Write a protein that holds these residues in place. Structure first.
Motif, PDB file in Angstrom:
ATOM      1  N   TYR A  22     -83.282   4.367 -38.696  1.00 42.45           N
ATOM      2  CA  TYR A  22     -83.066   4.321 -40.132  1.00 42.45           C
ATOM      3  C   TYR A  22     -83.982   5.260 -40.903  1.00 42.45           C
ATOM      4  O   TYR A  22     -83.584   5.751 -41.963  1.00 42.45           O
TER       5      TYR A  22
ATOM      6  N   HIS B  80     -83.016   8.966 -40.204  1.00 41.67           N
ATOM      7  CA  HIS B  80     -81.774   9.234 -40.916  1.00 41.67           C
ATOM      8  C   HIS B  80     -81.899   9.168 -42.432  1.00 41.67           C
ATOM      9  O   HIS B  80     -80.893   9.365 -43.104  1.00 41.67           O
ATOM     10  N   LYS B  81     -83.062   8.841 -43.000  1.00 42.18           N
ATOM     11  CA  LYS B  81     -83.274   9.018 -44.431  1.00 42.18           C
ATOM     12  C   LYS B  81     -84.303  10.069 -44.791  1.00 42.18           C
ATOM     13  O   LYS B  81     -84.349  10.480 -45.952  1.00 42.18           O
TER      14      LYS B  81
ATOM     15  N   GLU C 114     -81.748  13.368 -44.826  1.00 41.26           N
ATOM     16  CA  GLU C 114     -80.876  13.680 -45.954  1.00 41.26           C
ATOM     17  C   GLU C 114     -81.649  13.730 -47.259  1.00 41.26           C
ATOM     18  O   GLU C 114     -81.076  13.524 -48.330  1.00 41.26           O
ATOM     19  N   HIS C 115     -82.940  14.012 -47.184  1.00 42.09           N
ATOM     20  CA  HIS C 115     -83.784  14.112 -48.357  1.00 42.09           C
ATOM     21  C   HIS C 115     -84.450  15.473 -48.326  1.00 42.09           C
ATOM     22  O   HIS C 115     -84.864  16.007 -49.357  1.00 42.09           O
TER      23      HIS C 115
END
Lengths: 29, 48, 60
Positions: free
Chosen positions: C35, C38-39, C42-43
């Motif tokens: 998690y 995967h964040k 995309e940042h």
């Protein structure tokens, strides 16, 4: 005897919930 | 004395024996007596 | 320090419960780290994904 029964059962419910832990995979919980 | 049954034995054994430290004193031709980590590990059973 | 005796109080004086905790703890940890990778991905990349294509639907 009777300990080895249940002590067969505790890790017999590990496989069940350890191969229920490598393939189908509800993963939020 | 007769108020000590099989369930009383396991409860006092879990307080004094199970996964506890030991003390050893040895003398003589003792080169084949196992060492402290061998003895400390066998205060529990990794099988039940 | 009282959580350290209490966590050993309940679970591993036994050897099948223990194998539950290392298998089932391998999952909550694998999802806690998948998690966060995967964040952080995309940042660092805004405006560069596939759904950020302004002319996506319309080729003709």
């Amino acid at each position: 005897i009777q300990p080895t029964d249940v002590k067969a059962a505790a890790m017999w419910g590990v496989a069940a919930a350890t191969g229920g832990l490598y393939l189908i995979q509800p993963w939020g919980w | 004395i007769d108020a000590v049954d099989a369930s009383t034995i396991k409860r006092v054994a879990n307080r004094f024996i199970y996964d506890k430290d030991i003390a050893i004193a040895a003398m003589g031709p003792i080169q084949r007596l196992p060492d402290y980590n061998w003895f400390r590990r066998r205060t529990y059973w990794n099988r039940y | 320090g009282g959580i350290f005796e209490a966590l050993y109080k309940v679970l591993m004086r036994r050897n099948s419960v223990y194998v539950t905790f290392v298998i089932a703890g391998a999952f909550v940890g694998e999802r806690a780290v998948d998690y966060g990778v995967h964040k952080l991905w995309e940042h660092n990349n805004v405006g560069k994904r596939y759904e950020d294509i302004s002319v996506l639907g319309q080729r003709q």
